[PDB]
Structure formats: structure tokens, C-alpha cells
Amino acid sequence: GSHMKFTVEREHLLKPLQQVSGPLTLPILGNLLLQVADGTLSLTGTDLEMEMVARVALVQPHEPGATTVPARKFFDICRGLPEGAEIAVQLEGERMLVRSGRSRFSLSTLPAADFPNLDDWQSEVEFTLPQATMKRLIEATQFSMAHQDVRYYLNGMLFETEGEELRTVATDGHRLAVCSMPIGQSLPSHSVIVPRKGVIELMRMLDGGDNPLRVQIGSNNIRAHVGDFIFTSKLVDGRFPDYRRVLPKNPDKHLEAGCDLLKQAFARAAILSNEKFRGVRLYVSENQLKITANNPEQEEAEEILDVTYSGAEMEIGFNVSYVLDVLNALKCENVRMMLTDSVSSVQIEDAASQSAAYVVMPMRL
């Protein structure tokens, strides 16, 4: 195990190298851990909070061992080599040599023993689902996570198993997104908060393809297996809010309109909204929505849209970026807006599907 050596086709190394680099301050964190043992090359990248591992089968003679090498340089060398290149790698003293054709690269290393590992842990729940389902759950809610809120538990996404469904919840205290999907298995009840950087990396590993995703959840960690990749992240502490108590109770005013027409009207009104406050005013009346925006230069935008609405007239203010984020996430034919009054949240959803729901708190304009 002192003289690591392996030979691999470039085409078998490229996608694993790109993937493990995802989590990539401290010198060791800029390196990938390479480990060779009994027909497998393992490649690991970490940022101390999460780790990405890729397994590559070694079909050619190899010698066991381990080292760490600069990730970006190693990837760029392999990517820069011609299509079909054979890449021969070996440790030589404290340098890692990369050879292909008449190309030779000598890279600096840091000892494999110095590479930081996540603590040992035990899985409490396990389930398998299509990658497409996880992608849908994350994409439906990711934009509503907080970024650097003092309430740390909001800088991430809640993953919850309930009955036969997997659910995601994200909120920044102003707006909330919730999505749930049936995954054809009876599950125990569990709720964990995945850090926002972990949500982004989980999303990065979903290639759309038919390889299913296997999820393992512990008390303090989450792990996802997709093809030859294994992603592990620490979980966030704190009590995430309960979306069931955030959804507006008995909205008495239902508006329905085309998603694209509503989105384009908000997008044009936004041009003349205050750059800091982003406020727009909505006036709902019989089969009509009027959107108005003004800025400190007293420029004004006004949009009038035909909609389906027969409730009482009302005026309500919103941050237009929050409304546009919802409409951009819906990607559907028709949208339903469920209102109460000028000081209460609005619930927005696809008129044809209850799988996702969005809640936006108004502004006092």
C-alpha cells in the first residue's frame, strides 16, 4: 500500500473527477483523495460539512495505495488529454505522476492520512426513488431557502418522509415552498434539514437518467447513492417550522389565470418597481387583475389582465421577485392564487396539481 499505481481510460475518469470536485480555504480541502484497492479506484472531495465519493473499476493491473492531489489541476489535465487517451498514474516519492502518450505531469501531493473524514454514523431510514422525483422535489422549493439568515435552520431544506410520500419544505421567513411526491413505499416519519450547499450538491449529482437514487438518513447525516457516486452531508440543527400551520386558513378569494400571462405581466411591472423594496400593488376585481409598480423617480408601470375571479374587491402588496420566483417554479398552464385580505399571506399553486404549494407574505405599501 506504499506505491499507488493505476491505468484508466480518460472516458472512465472524466465524469467521476468533475462530480467529486463539487464540494470544492485550507490546503487539504483543495485536493481529492485517491485510493486504490482490489479493482477499485475511489475519488473523494470534501468541504468538512459534506463529501462526494466516486468509485471507478480498475480493469488493468494496479497497485494499492492512497494519496491526495490538487483537484482542479488533475481534472484539467485529464480533460485536456485527447479523446480515447489511456491515463497512467503513479505515486513517485511525494509527487503524483500522470502520463498519457508523450504528455507527462508531476503534481504535488498531501498525505492520504491528512485527508479529513466525516465521523462514523448509523442510518435510521432507507428508501429508493427515481432521480426525476428528487429533482422535482428540490427544484420546486430550492429558491425559497434562506441564504445567511440568523435562524440557521432556514439556510437549508427540510426533507420529510410521511406515509408513502417524500416532502421538501423551504422558507426564508417571507415566503415558503412545499412539495410532496408519492414514492411507492410505506415509510417511517422523519424530518431532517439538509444544508443549502448540500441541497445544491445533491441536485448536481442527479443526471436525469434512470439510475435510481438510494437515500439513507441518520440522526445527524444524510447519504445519497446514485450510480457509482455516494454523497454524504451533515444535517442542520434547529426546529424547522411546520408548513401545515403556515398555509393560509380558509382563503375566501380564488383567482385563476394563465401562468405565462401572469408571469409576463409581473416581469414587465417589476422593471419600474423600487430597486430595493421591489413592491408591486395587486388590485383584484370581477374577472380582472391590475398590477401597478412605481419607483422613487415616480416612473410607473400598470398591467391589466383578464383573469377568472368573482370574490370581493381587494388590494394587496407584494415583493414582485417573490411572486416571479413562484411563477417561474410552477412551469404549468394555469395558476390559482388563494387570497384572504391585504395583511395575510397568499397561497399560489398550479391550478391542475396540488403536489406543490407556495405561500408569500404581503408587504405594507
Partner: peptide
Amino acid sequence: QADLPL
């Protein structure tokens, strides 16, 4: 901006 009742 008003806060959601979290």
C-alpha cells in the same frame, strides 16, 4: 415586508 407566522 411582513413576516410569515413561522
